[PDB]
């Protein structure tokens, strides 16, 4: 009796597809069916960027056409939607937060367009990053064979559950040397769920600056842990500031899971939807700190001006304008009172927005600054 992977593979391989994409160029990659009914297939953004036509070849050879749904080049993840989905097979996702270095891994992709090719490996390491500092990268590292075309392919565990998305390799010559990187499934879970619900990614921030924790800075600041996130400063009006995070704190955990580096922690929440309530483990003055937080963004205000109504149908008074906004480019000093615009009287933001809904090419505002009546122009 011989062990083999064919039991797991003949069940999973139909769920992983091969992509053909069409200075015009033609490229190929891989994707994995997430929702069998809706035909949602996730892949790498650098595979389907600047794509005019998107053709998918399933495991059986069936061709389909897909359209763009969402994209996030900062994390290199994109979602397409198969049109006319007929008899598809979704993949089961696992929680990658339970992965351990030493677990066996399985890589499915389309190397050099040769077809769906399967290769084996193990968890080399986790949380590795550094090849592109501006990208949200928390990669899984594996010695599984991965080459050009495996991009957007599937990284599954021994039970065929999706653990990561093969994305990039480290190769001095353009050929695999046993170093491949994959985006953990949990990040793709958070990343894809926004593309289905919002069409783009609602990016949240906590309003803190910082840098990684090395062993030499742990010496000067009398900090126990040799690795984590160092609070350089907290921005005012940030959730972290309102939560009570001060500078000089050291972050050790996220929701209980310890932290590997600042750069890895940065990629985690860079994928969480706005408002995600989380718990952090801090270290200030050698004392363990826990905090609950809620991400934030990075009457009716129109185009960089906060406004509201005044009196009883007496117009839309401008409450405040920040210098340097599209609404401070056309003056609109704080305190303006719009009685009308474009020969129509404005009682409220509703009669205003009903004219904004008309989307005019040019806008003439009949505001009053001081005791005088002036006009302002837009677009």
């Amino acid at each position: 009796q011989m062990p083999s992977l064919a039991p797991m593979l003949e069940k999973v391989m139909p769920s992983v597809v091969s992509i053909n994409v069409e200075q015009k160029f033609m490229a190929l990659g891989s994707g994995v069916i997430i929702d069998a009914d809706k035909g949602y297939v996730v892949t790498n953004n650098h595979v389907v960027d600047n794509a005019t036509v998107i053709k998918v070849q399933l495991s059986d050879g069936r061709k389909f056409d897909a359209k763009m749904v969402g994209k996030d080049p900062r994390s290199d993840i994109a979602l397409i939607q198969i049109q006319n989905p007929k008899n598809l097979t979704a993949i089961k996702m696992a929680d990658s937060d339970a992965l351990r270095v030493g677990d066996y891994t399985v890589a499915i992709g389309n190397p050099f367009g040769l077809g769906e090719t399967v290769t084996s490996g193990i968890v080399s390491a986790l949380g590795r990053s550094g090849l592109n500092a501006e990208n949200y990268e928390n990669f899984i590292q594996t010695d599984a064979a991965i080459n050009r075309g495996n991009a957007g392919g599937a990284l599954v565990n021994l039970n065929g559950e999706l653990i990561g998305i093969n994305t990039a390799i480290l190769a001095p010559d353009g050929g695999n040397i046993g170093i491949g990187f994959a985006i953990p499934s949990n990040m793709v879970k958070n990343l894809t769920s926004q593309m289905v619900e919002y069409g783009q990614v609602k990016r949240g921030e906590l309003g803190i600056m910082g840098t990684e924790l090395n062993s030499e800075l742990a010496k000067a600041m009398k900090v126990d842990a040799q690795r984590g996130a160092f609070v350089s400063q907290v921005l005012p009006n940030s959730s972290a500031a309102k939560a009570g995070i001060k500078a000089g704190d050291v972050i050790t955990s996220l929701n209980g899971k310890p932290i590997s580096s600042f750069a890895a922690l940065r990629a985690q929440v860079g994928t969480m939807p706005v408002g995600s309530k989380l718990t952090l483990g801090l270290l200030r003055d050698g004392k363990q700190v826990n905090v609950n937080l809620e991400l934030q963004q990075s009457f009716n205000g129109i185009e960089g001006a906060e406004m509201s109504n005044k009196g009883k149908d007496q117009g839309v008074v401008v409450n405040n304008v920040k210098t340097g906004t599209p609404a401070a480019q056309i003056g609109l000093k704080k305190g303006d009172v719009i009685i009308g615009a474009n020969q129509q009287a404005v009682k409220n933001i509703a009669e205003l927005r009903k004219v904004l809904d008309s989307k005019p090419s040019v806008l003439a505002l009949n505001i009053q600054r001081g005791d005088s009546t002036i006009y302002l122009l837009m677009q």
Binding site: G130, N132, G149, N166, A168, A171
Partner: peptide, 5 residues
């Protein structure tokens, strides 16, 4: 200095 796939 470093490449992807």
């Amino acid at each position: 200095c470093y490449r992807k796939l």
